C-alpha cells in the first residue's frame, strides 16, 4: 500500500494511480515572480464561525480533524471559487527536520509543514461526488514555519498522544480552525489535484502567502506520531509530503500585488 517510504513513496504512486503523471498534479513550486496578479480575483471569504469539529483520526498517512459537513456551517467562498465549499477536514504534512515538510514550495523554499483545509463544492451534494469533478474541491493551504508557538494549534498537539497509531481516533469537538489562520488572506491559486492517492484532479488550490508560526515543541509532537498501527514496528510519521510536480500548462495567479 502507498505511503512515504523508500519502497512505497511518491515515486511509486504512478504504478497504481497513473494520474500521478497527469496534467494538473499537485503540489507545485510557486514561482513568485512568474505568478501573475489577477485583479479580477475576489477576496477570500472564510466563514468558520459555526464550524463543528467532531473527531481527530490518525489514518496512517496524516491526522485529520473532521468536521460536521452535513450543513453549511464552515464554508469557503470567493477568491477564485464559484459557489460554496464546505469544510470537511483539515490535516497537515510535515518533515523530519524543520527544513522540509511542506508540499507546495515558494521559489523552491520548503517550509516545515503545510496545513490543508479541505472543502467540497456543495453543488455536488457529497464529497465523494465532488472529487469526481474538476471543480469539486477547494483546499486552503497554509505554510508553517518554526518560531513562536501557534496558540490555536495547541489543542491539536495535545490530543496527538491519544491517536499515536494508524486507525486510532479521538473525540475532538469545539475546535475552532480560525485559530490556525495567519493574519493576511493574500493567496496564490491554481488548478490541481489531491496530493495523496487517488491524486484526483479535482482541486482548486488556494495557498496563503503568509505562513503561520508554530513552535519547535509543537512540530516535534507531530513527529512522534506513527505511520504504523498499534502492535506493529514503530515508524515515525514524518516526511508525509509529496514533492513538487510539473506545472505543465498551468498559470498560478496571485491575489495581491
Ligand atoms: C516493501 C514495501 C512494498 C510496497 O509498498 N510496494 C509498493 N509498490 N507501489 C506502491 S503504490 N500504492 O505507491 O503505488 S507500494
Ligand atoms: C474525508 C475527506 C477525504 C480527503 O480529504 N482526501 C484528501 N486526499 N488528499 C488531500 S490533500 N493533501 O490534497 O488536501 S485531501
Ligand atoms: Zn494534504
UniProtKB/Swiss-Prot annotation:
Enzyme class: lyase
Binding site for substrate: 195-196
Effect of residue 15 to E: In Jogjakarta
Binding site for Zn(2+): 91, 93, 116
Entry GO CC: apical part of cell; cytoplasm; cytosol; extracellular exosome; myelin sheath; plasma membrane
Effect of pH on activity: Optimum pH is 6-8.
Effect of residue 62 to F: Reduced activity
Catalyzed reaction equations: hydrogencarbonate + H(+) = CO2 + H2O; urea = cyanamide + H2O
Compartments where found: Cytoplasm; Cell membrane
SMART domains xref list: Carb_anhydrase
Effect seen on changing residue 64 to L: Reduced activity
Its job: Catalyzes the reversible hydration of carbon dioxide. Can also hydrate cyanamide to urea. Stimulates the chloride-bicarbonate exchange activity of SLC26A6. Essential for bone resorption and osteoclast differentiation. Involved in the regulation of fluid secretion into the anterior chamber of the eye. Contributes to intracellular pH regulation in the duodenal upper villous epithelium during proton-coupled peptide absorption.
Something else known: Target of drugs used in treatments against glaucoma disorder and breast cancer.
Name used for this protein in its record: Carbonic anhydrase 2
Gene: CA2
